[PDB]
Amino acid sequence: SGFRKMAFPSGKVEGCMVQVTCGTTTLNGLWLDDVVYCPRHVICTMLNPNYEDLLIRKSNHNFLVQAGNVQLRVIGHSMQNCVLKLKVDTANPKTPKYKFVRIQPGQTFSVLACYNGSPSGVYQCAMRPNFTIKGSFLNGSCGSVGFNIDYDCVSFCYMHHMELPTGVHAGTDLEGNFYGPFVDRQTAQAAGTDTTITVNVLAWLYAAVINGDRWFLNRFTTTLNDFNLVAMKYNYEPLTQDHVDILGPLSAQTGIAVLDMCASLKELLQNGMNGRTILGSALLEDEFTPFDVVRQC
């Protein structure tokens, strides 16, 4: 029992992390097979780069790639969306089975925060509805990646690129397509209104229940359309039938019908928590997916 925000073991990703330097700039790259992936702004001196015109000026020898102390030799370079892809003479012997994945808003993943090619720490976070993440990313953290692990397979879903003036974080998938509307330029850019991930809050109540926290369990039910009315009011994401289907196995575990759980949540939204806690949080937690709960419970 017990319930913690857990990250995936980071070892398979630790073995892919390298340092990439171009000119003055150093950040992190991901080394898989004989390719090294990193943010393309590694080639910048920043307020509106022409990335094609700045890339042109660079040649293979202008890129220094270091895997621990081993200096890799760069035999090719190309730019795909917002990532640069450096061909190196040497396939990474520690490449795990991996995939590249574009996650949907609401899904979760682990971040291995790195500096100069070396790991500092690992932590779990969620792709917000507005396509940002609330991480811990200092200068030099760019190129750190987010990932999920299924048995033996590393699904890479995020690579870090920037901090917004608000202090949240934006980045790309490993094809270099930004999540959200952001661009890799040094402007004030607006995230967008955020919202809570309702299907994740419900999953976490199911987790609370499984752990003996049941005080919020009310004697009401509600309808999907009537709950949704309340969720719009409290900037919660609309709950869909797909979400109900997803919450089914937790419903049958606890014997609490999803729409019953929705009525408990409605009353929580409408009257607060009254100073109590749920799984040791005084807030409604929306960064656990239904899959996350099942994996841990």
**What is the contact surface with ligand A1AWA in residues (CB under 6 A)?**
1, 27, 41, 44, 46, 137-142, 162-165, 184-188
The residue ranges that bind its own copies (CB under 8 A) are 1-12, 14-15, 112-116, 118-123, 125, 134-138, 140-141, 163, 167-169, 211-212, 277, 280-283, 295-297
User: Nearer Cβ to its own copies, position 80 or 296?
Assistant: 296
Least gap, CB of 78 to ligand A1AWA (angstroms): 18
Which is closer to ligand A1AWA, CB of 184 or CB of 237?
A: 184
Q: Name which of ligand A1AWA, its own copies, none residue 41 binds, using a CB cut-off of 5 to 8 Å depending on partner kind.
A: ligand A1AWA
Q: What is the CA radius of gyration of the chain?
A: 22
Q: How many CB atoms lie within 10 A of CB 83?
A: 25
In the residue annotation, 142 being an active-site residue is answered as yes
The item of its own copies, ligand A1AWA, none sharing an interface with residue 255, based on CB under 5 to 8 Å by kind, is none
Cα–Cα distance for residue pair 287/128, rounded to 1 Å: 9
What tokens appear for 95 in the block?
């490449």
- Going by C-alpha positions, the residue among 77, 86, 69, 84 that lies closest to residue 33 is 86
d(CA 268, CA 249): 23
Q: Which does 267 bind (CB under 5 to 8 A by kind): ligand A1AWA, its own copies, none?
A: none
Complex with ligand A1AWA: residue 87 or 185, whichever CB lies closer: 185
Question: Measured from the CB of residue 219, what is the shortest distance to its own copies in angstroms?
Answer: 26
3-state DSSP assignment of residue 290: helix
164 binding partner (options ligand A1AWA, its own copies, none; Cβ < 5 to 8 Å by kind): ligand A1AWA
Annotated catalytic residue 61: no
Measure the CA–CA gap between 157 and 31, rounded to whole angstroms: 15
Q: In whole angstroms, what is the distance from residue 114 CA to residue 109 CA?
A: 16
Nearest Cα residue to 86 out of 6, 30, 48, 142: 30
Catalytic residue among 41, 77, 161, 169: 41
The CA distance from 171 to 140, in Å, is 14
Of 53 and 152, which has the nearer Cβ to its own copies? Answer: 152
**Residue 8 one-letter amino acid:** F
Q: Which does 121 bind (CB under 5 to 8 A by kind): ligand A1AWA, its own copies, none?
A: its own copies
Catalytic residue among 22, 142, 157, 262: 142
Cross-strand bridge partners of residue 78: 85
Q: Which residues are catalytic?
A: 41, 142
